[PDB]
Each structure stands twice: as C-alpha cells, then as structure tokens.
Amino acid sequence: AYVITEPCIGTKDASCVEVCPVDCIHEGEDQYYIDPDVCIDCGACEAVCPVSAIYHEDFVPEEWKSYIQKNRDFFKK
Ligand code: SF4
Ligand code: F3S
C-alpha cells in the first residue's frame, strides 16, 4: 500500500486525489491521508506527487511508519 509521509503536511494540496482508481485519498487534520489497504499498490499517484511524498509503507522510514499506522487507523477500527 502507498501511504502519505511528512512532506505533504502543510503542503496540503498539489494534488493527488482525483488520479486514484479507487479514490481512497481522504482528508485529515491538515493534509490528506490514504487508505493503504484499499489502495491496490499502484504507481499513478506516486509519479504525480511532488517528490513522491506518497511513499510505500515499507520504504517509509521507521520514523514515519507511525503515519502509515495512522493512515491505517483513520480507516481502520
Ligand atoms: S497508489 Fe494508486 S491506488 Fe493507491 S492511493 Fe495511489 S493512486 Fe490510489
Ligand atoms: S503533496 Fe500531498 S496532496 Fe497528494 S500530491 Fe502529494 S500527497
């Protein structure tokens, strides 16, 4: 699953949203978040996002594995 990181915070829009086949980009506090478990591991938003602020959950640094859990939590239970 492809997930937000730090750099989109405050940047807030650009934007990714509309490109996603399964539209699973949803707003949070400031920036958007993504449902990674709905997201089908695709490369569309990755390419469009400035400097790919959208990073894959694995690649996402441990520091920001927190945010990835957050993006989950947002649409989890
Ligand atoms: S990686 Fe694709 S499926 Fe996933 S959030 Fe991005 S555009 Fe949507
Ligand atoms: S900057 Fe943020 S709005 Fe989307 S295009 Fe990147 S995740």
UniProtKB/Swiss-Prot annotation:
Residues of the 4Fe-4S ferredoxin-type domain: 1-28, 30-59
Residues reported in the UniProt entry to bind [4Fe-4S] cluster: C20, C39, C42, C45
Record keywords, A-Z: 3Fe-4S, 4Fe-4S, Electron transport, Iron, Iron-sulfur, Metal-binding, Repeat, Transport
InterPro entries from the UniProt entry: 4Fe4S_Fe-S-bd (IPR017896), 4Fe4S_Fe_S_CS (IPR017900), 7Fe_ferredoxin (IPR000813), RnfB_subfamily (IPR050294)
GO MF, any single term: 4 iron, 4 sulfur cluster binding
Required cofactor names: [4Fe-4S] cluster; [3Fe-4S] cluster
Free-text remark on how the cofactor is bound: Binds 1 [4Fe-4S] cluster. Binds 1 [3Fe-4S] cluster.
Pfam families the record matches: Fer4
Domain of life, source organism: Bacteria
Binding site for [3Fe-4S] cluster: C8, C16, C49
SUPFAM superfamilies named in the record: 4Fe-4S ferredoxins
Protein name in the entry: Ferredoxin 7Fe
Organism the protein comes from: Hydrogenibacillus schlegelii (Bacillus schlegelii)
Lineage: Bacteria, Bacillati, Bacillota, Bacilli, Bacillales
